[PDB]
Design a protein around this nucleic acid. Sequence first.
DNA 1: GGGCTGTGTTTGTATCAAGTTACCTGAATGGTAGGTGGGGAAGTCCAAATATTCCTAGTAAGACAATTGCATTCAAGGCCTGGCTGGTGAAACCTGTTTCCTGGGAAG
Lengths: 97, 97, 110, 54, 94, 94, 83, 83
Amino acid sequence: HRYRPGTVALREIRRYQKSTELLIRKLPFQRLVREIAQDFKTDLRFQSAAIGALQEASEAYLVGLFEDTNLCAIHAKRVTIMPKDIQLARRIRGERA
Amino acid sequence: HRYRPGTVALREIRRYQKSTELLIRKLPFQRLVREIAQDFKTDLRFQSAAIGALQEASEAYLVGLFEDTNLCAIHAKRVTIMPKDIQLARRIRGERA
Amino acid sequence: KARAKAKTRSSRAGLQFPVGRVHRLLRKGNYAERVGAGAPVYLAAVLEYLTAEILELAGNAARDNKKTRIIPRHLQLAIRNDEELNKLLGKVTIAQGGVLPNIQAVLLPK
Amino acid sequence: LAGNAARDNKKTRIIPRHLQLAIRNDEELNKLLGKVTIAQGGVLPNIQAVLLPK
Amino acid sequence: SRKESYSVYVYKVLKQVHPDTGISSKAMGIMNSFVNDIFERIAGEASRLAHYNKRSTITSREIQTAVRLLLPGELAKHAVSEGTKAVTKYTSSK
Amino acid sequence: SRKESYSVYVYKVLKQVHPDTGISSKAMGIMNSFVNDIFERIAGEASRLAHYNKRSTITSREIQTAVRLLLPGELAKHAVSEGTKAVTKYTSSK
Amino acid sequence: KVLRDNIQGITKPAIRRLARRGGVKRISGLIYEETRGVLKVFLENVIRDAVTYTEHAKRKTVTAMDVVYALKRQGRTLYGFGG
Amino acid sequence: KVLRDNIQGITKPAIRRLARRGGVKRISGLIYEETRGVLKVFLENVIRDAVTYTEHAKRKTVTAMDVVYALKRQGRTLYGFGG
DNA sequence: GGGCTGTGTTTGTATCAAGTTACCTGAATGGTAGGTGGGGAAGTCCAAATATTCCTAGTAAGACAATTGCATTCAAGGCCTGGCTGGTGAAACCTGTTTCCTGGGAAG
Ligand SMILES: [Mg+2]
């Protein structure tokens, strides 16, 4: 009937750790590259295997970030991640100077 | 007269962040390498600039570890580091599999 | 005139990865100026042991989930199941894989 | 930058501590050598301002 | 034109330990690009082993040290002995 | 025998922006080994730029791209324009 | 061509779904303004390294091996697209 | 040559003094059995990579550039000793 | 006691790949001659490792004091979940254009 909080959530963890699908969709990630590329050189083309080389590398970083974020949230006797965790996750690896 | 706890401690932080001295002494670190080298090849010699290349690289790692340990101890509303911090410090960087 | 039977150097060493193709990828990659005759033999073997060891482990995960062909999820999951294969590819993303199933056993429901 | 830190601490010659401290004082010089240990340097003076005494 | 590859030489290894097994196209390219990457790690560490010992020569000794560096633990015990079989078999021939 | 170095060419730069400044022995070796490392990053990325575009030639264009990769942000704006002065001065001579 | 408000294209569930792949049960509402920041840092250190390859060969199309060469540079190798 | 009990050579103040360089005020008494463990992990991934260079040139002395080449391999560069 | 979502089993076809080959060229091999690089054996000298003591400094320890860390309780806020609406994303279709894409070619 009424699920408790943390039950539909844990169904999602075993769901998405099994599939191989695209989580960030294509066109709202393709247009993100058409903002950062405009600075360094206007009028560039992209092969769709290179955009997909980013959509499987940006999703390779956040999942590598959030799984190292959630270590901190558990570490502070919590089960909730917070933006003080990520900003201290990245300072340990040296991914932000 | 009687210092409070945290006063002689904070004198040490501004002391050792100023000097360039050796903290781990030479011979109780030189003999540490004569335990790990015995497995891979017995009867090896070491140049003293190579042992010192380790004494300034092992002290380059723990200080890089403890300064990233103390971020976690402050993060759990504490001022004390604990061995649950280091074992979660290293899991974030990927320095232990 | 004719000549003798051309026996390939991959069949003269008992390997499957070529040695003729590896030996022109050590003289057109500017790795060094001289490349020994035994070096692309020895390197095509190490390319052949490590190509088995993934596909040995990629065969099992295909079988354990009732599959004929190995899709990249199995390559994602054959890696990071083995310990020493993971420490080689510790920095490496495999495309279209997702991650291993993992919960930290604190988020379990109450 | 290694000349300035030698001057600000009243030194004629540049010892590696100054090279340690000229790096990681500048931001963009640090992002080049972010992985790099400099020998015989120690670290910058740093407290997280929570360990200050009470 | 011609794209050289290692795709053919996978079927000659896939049909050695799993003879009733196919492999998809997009999984070939991983085992294709696994090879080209693990090629130039071993070569590109044997290359930098040539400069460190002042020789212009990549021997078959230098590939052995550039496999005992990249492969950890138990792969470094097998892939060494899975090469020195394929050399001793090679040199006794010809 | 002979150990080539960049130690002499530091005093010809140290005495350009701080003419009343010495430098120690063990700090020379850092700026010595800073050079040899930042040499082979730029060369060893210009080298791998030769294979990626199928040329056997390291031009002075390829060193410019292998400095806009290794140097971040504001160093990549100066060290490009601090090279093209030293080339245009060089080529107008001779 | 200019299309703005597309750092806001990384929607609120699609960061939650990425959080679920990392093994995260409960999240805050202030990760969404942190993730979009850390993402655009990572794409301003790949596209900045990718375009200098594509400009160097005087190509107008940043091809598939270009991005892989950029990710080769940072030490995060991507298999499956070549290179 | 064998000399044991020298992971216990990293003494109790010399881990505290390393803790003070990191900016740490108060420590536990159970870091001492953690630090000696994390230290010997780091020296079983450098000496294992250093000796394979020294054996490769058939030298009996692990020289100064050898360790720097090992630290080059892991991605933790050490300046000041060459290399 | 009941329910929901995940899971499984069976069928058909489309698609993807497996198959075999045709050629044709690219490349892969065979036989050779040449030089060079490296490998090997040596030696004086070189750098490190040891045996020692000596002294000293900080290491180790025992005691004490006070803060912090922990565990509980309190209070509520924040977030998760779901019933709903709709705007866009994606998949399928069509193309002209643009760029490449080596490759060859001309001309200064
Ligand atoms: Mg004319």
